[model samples]
Target: RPSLCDLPADSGSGTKAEKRIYYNSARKQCLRFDYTGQGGNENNFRRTYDCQRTCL
Candidate 1:
């Protein structure tokens, strides 16, 4: 399985396009991205540490 941090953020294809975050496992850092209201995976996060703690 892929690491949660390694998973790329799904700027979901629905509609919202709201601001979001995901952990970049290769860089070992969290980053922000735009997200839709649907179809996103579990790799998304609202706060930086949210993904950090989860991934780590």
Candidate 2:
């Protein structure tokens, strides 16, 4: 399953949006990595974030 963690303490400004924390079943780790915000429609089928995680 996916969980969007709201790290209020982590953010110095305390106004940042929640981050996406995806669980990858294959990798067996949480795939919470940085990704450029290049718009949702930027990529049709090649956007890696769309299906990067496969939770158990």
Candidate 3:
């Protein structure tokens, strides 16, 4: 099974509006929060980094 952190951008599978803690490969940040919509739209994806860890 692919862990949430291993998934590529906008490729998360599942049916639910949930937040996932994953790594941002592009930014090389291990602490991240990804929010996806249940509608399966890539444009609806949003992400944020954990400033307490990744930022510092």
Maximum-TM-score candidate:
1
Residue runs of model 3 more than 4 Å from their true location after superposition: 1-7, 31-56
Residue-level lDDT of model 3, residues 1-56, one tens digit each, is 22344445453556565664445555656443445443332222244444223322
Off by over 4 Å in 1: none
Q: Tell me the tens digit of each residue's lDDT in model 1 across 1-56.
A: 34666677788778775887888777777788888877778888888777767875
Every model's TM-score: 0.77, 0.25, 0.32
lDDT of 2 at 15: 42
- Candidate 1 TM-score, C-alpha based: 0.77
Better TM-score candidate (1, 2): 1
Error of 3 at 56 (Å): 12
Instruction: Order the candidate numbers by lDDT, best to worst.
Output: 1, 3, 2
| Cα lDDT computed for each candidate against the true fold | 0.77, 0.34, 0.42
Better of 1 and 3 by lDDT: 1
Give the winner by lDDT: 1
Check candidate 2 and list the clashing pairs: none
